[PDB]
Design a protein around this nucleic acid. Structure first.
Ligand SMILES: Nc1ncnc2c1ncn2[C@@H]1O[C@H](COS(=O)(=O)NC(=O)[C@@H](N)CO)[C@@H](O)[C@H]1O
Ligand SMILES: Nc1ncnc2c1ncn2[C@@H]1O[C@H](COS(=O)(=O)NC(=O)[C@@H](N)CO)[C@@H](O)[C@H]1O
Ligand SMILES: [Mn+2]
Lengths: 421, 394
RNA sequence: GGAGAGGUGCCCGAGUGGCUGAAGGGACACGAAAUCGUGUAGGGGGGCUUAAACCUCCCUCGCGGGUUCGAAUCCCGCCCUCUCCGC
């Protein structure tokens, strides 16, 4: 959600954002409807002022006028009722249009679609094996960690791990939580479902609604990320300035429909319906300086996690057309997956300024007493099992076993993962 | 699913089981409908030796479809040692550990959560009633308990597994969750998928259609998966806080064994001792409860619940539920094995909770609370938490 | 799936139709141990103004709608909380 007052006064700023982000939105029709709504409000307020007048002047009034004054206030009520209905319809349509308005991206973001995504940093590189390397699926098959029977049970885009790799998945999640905890972030375990209000607050609705699984015969939807829950926690609250910034490390199972992924990542751990993810969520004051600081921290935290996992990664600056309607800036972190001979996303670091805060009604009281919309940020801490794909391939041994990075030995109690069958 | 031939030979035994388990099922209408399917098969065999033949096959389909939906409701006879009656007839087998002694008025787990800021009650507005969200050390504690249960089970000879929380209809039918407990399961809209209330649904479905080798038996699985349940109660101390919620985490013990009462009794005992030893290591007072036939479920041969003591309520609360189902699930899920004589037989299935959060946290908080309001960590969990006492956040 | 009790400002809480955007107590801040005094919601129009400040009007007493001359108060739907039952 953008500032409506700012939208009226700098509309070309938002029209340029619409184009660069590929949003299908008629900004002029939006501005036309807004002017209708504002006019109709003025009318309603005119009737409501008379309503309140007449109501105040009925009690102490001469009986000879009493009848006429009550009948007059009754007609005022019937007209306000007619205006409220007209205003209710128009504001509904204006809401649907306003939920599509994108936030203008930061100038440094490449303008274009996915093609314009541009690498900015690279740490470590493709490993050089003195043996023919195996893909992660094959490694799991060799070590007996893969349960292919799960597709018969649960359908495509499902997975089930066996043996040490199952314990490895749960260790990776705790490894990420412990890391985030000792970086100042408050750990939280959260549910994986919420009502529509929460998806509207983050921006997942309406733009990404087909990516969400709904729970039938309920008003609930399965969340694809703990961001949905963490962002909705403080809706309608006016937080104190001294509480800021809020740094949350929320773990929750994730569910994703993966609509429109027909033909992409059909086999493996890369693109499944249900996974595990530890989320970084930051709520800070309405300051570019503070947002830039939190953004850098979220990136560094994710990078450090990958450094401890001993994985070669790269940062990618995401282009306007691949960035999302609400994003000021987005930087993806990609880890190299040899079997695909290319880097694959593992994290997505996003600054959204007040765009989510204006949807979820996230506000704080600054030191001077002014209530202002906060700025929100989020980034992956660690998500399984996609990360396991890189871990298996980058840490495979000659004999087909998989090493465990130094930082994970205390969690697993072994230096090399033991096979099952 | 019960054996058809067994049902024809001894119908009185399955009348007794319907009465003692209280199943809304007319067995005489099922038997009559079974005879009616047999008569239609006697007409077709006379046409096979010698349009009218296709009309008898279009009636057969309908009759068989009705018979199948009605066979899925036939209960398994319980073991004689099970009390007859409802929940009131549940009999305490034993109890281990005494109620805790406090030199101060104990707090309930919600109050302990409020005091230390381990609670996020704002989740009710985000996700609706009957939800929870943990903060600080209690959040870390929940994840520690799950890894602890998986490490324990893995050292006890069970194969650890991380599993999805959704499956197709066949898997719920295969365990018995469908059609009896359909209204306890959330469906995923615009899919043919349903959210599982227990990893039992996935573990039982894995080997559907396979003939397992005798040597591979017994199968011992410790599957972890988030759990989803449509009914988490309404309000009150029975559901308040961490006690009953729509989504939770559970580590599931699941055993598939050969078709012998000896093998099943051995497995049943193992599932108990595992949960008991988990509760022992968690330093929690618990008790075992034999479940009566009417509170047992249609497919259960024997069910023992394990309950843990909750001081604020001065009562025991169910934390584990240990079941033996003989081949009642195997006949639904098509779980078969080859015995040493080379004969294909339906296997026996068992399951029991290993550990489920966050309900177990309610007992942990109240039983291990200190005077100042902190909560100590049992020795078995210090390596997982890195501290002896849970520190507060807010 | 039911029964009863509720939801008011920073919190507890008074309000059986207008004297209530709101008493009293606590908390906090400021000013003049205890005491006294003052202060203590958000949103949106309009006037004036560069702006701010100031003046004025409208909406919100969990959310939305309805009744009425008039609603925090009465009705309806939804949401949440507590206690007892159902599963
Ligand atoms: N379908 C999927 N299967 C497996 N992992 C996935 C899937 N979708 C996302 N992930 C993992 O979750 C991470 C976050 O995904 S994201 O949508 O791009 N970003 C977010 O959700 C933000 N909340 C920041 O985490 C991905 O980088 C990837 O590691
Ligand atoms: N709605 C719920 N909220 C919190 N915990 C629950 C909930 N439902 C079940 N549990 C926990 O999960 C355990 C297993 O529940 S059970 O249905 O009785 N048993 C099973 O599901 C069997 N598959 C064995 O686990 C319970 O004993 C309890 O500890
Ligand atoms: Mn209910």
């Amino acid at each position: 959600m953008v500032d409506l007052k700012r939208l009226r006064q700098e509309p070309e700023v938002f029209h340029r954002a619409i184009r660069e982000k590929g949003v299908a939105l008629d900004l002029e029709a939006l501005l036309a409807l807004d002017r209708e709504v504002q006019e109709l409000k003025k009318r309603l307020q005119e009737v409501q002022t008379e309503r309140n007048q007449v109501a105040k002047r009925v009690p102490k009034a001469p009986p000879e006028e009493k009848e006429a004054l009550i009948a007059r206030g009754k007609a005022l009520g019937e007209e306000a009722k007619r205006l409220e209905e007209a205003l209710r319809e128009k504001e509904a349509r204006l809401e649907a249009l306003l939920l599509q308005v994108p936030l203008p991206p930061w100038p440094g973001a490449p303008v274009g679609g996915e093609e314009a995504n541009r690498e900015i940093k690279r740490v470590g590189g493709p490993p050089e094996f003195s043996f023919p390397p195996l893909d992660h699926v094959a490694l799991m098959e060799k070590n007996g960690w893969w349960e292919p029977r799960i597709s018969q049970v649960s359908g495509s885009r499902s997975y089930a791990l066996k043996g040490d790799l199952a314990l490895y998945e749960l260790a990776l999640l705790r490894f990420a939580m412990d890391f985030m905890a000792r970086r100042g972030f408050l750990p939280m375990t959260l549910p994986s479902y919420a009502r529509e209000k929460a998806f509207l607050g983050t921006g997942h609705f309406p733009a990404y609604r087909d990516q969400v699984w709904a729970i039938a015969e309920t008003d609930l939807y399965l969340t694809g990320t703990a961001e949905v829950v963490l962002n909705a926690l403080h809706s309608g609250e006016i937080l104190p300035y001294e509480a800021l910034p809020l740094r949350y490390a929320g773990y929750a199972p994730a569910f994703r429909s993966e609509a429109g992924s027909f033909g992409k990542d059909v086999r493996g751990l890369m693109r499944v319906h249900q996974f595990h993810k530890v989320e970084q969520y930051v709520l800070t004051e309405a300051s570019l300086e503070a947002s830039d600081r939190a953004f850098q921290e979220l990136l560094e935290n994710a990078e450090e996690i990958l450094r401890l996992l001993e994985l070669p990664y790269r940062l990618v600056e995401v282009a306007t057309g691949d960035m999302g309607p609400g994003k000021w800036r987005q930087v993806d972190i990609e880890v190299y997956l040899p079997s695909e001979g290319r880097y694959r996303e593992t994290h997505s670091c996003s600054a959204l300024l007040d765009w989510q805060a204006r949807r979820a009604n996230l506000r704080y009281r600054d030191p001077e007493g002014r209530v202002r919309y906060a700025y929100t940020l989020n980034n992956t801490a660690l998500a399984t099992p996609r990360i396991l794909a890189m871990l298996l391939e980058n840490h495979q041994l000659q004999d087909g076993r998989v090493r465990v990075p130094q930082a994970l030995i205390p969690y697993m109690g072994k230096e090399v993962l033991e096979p099952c069958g």
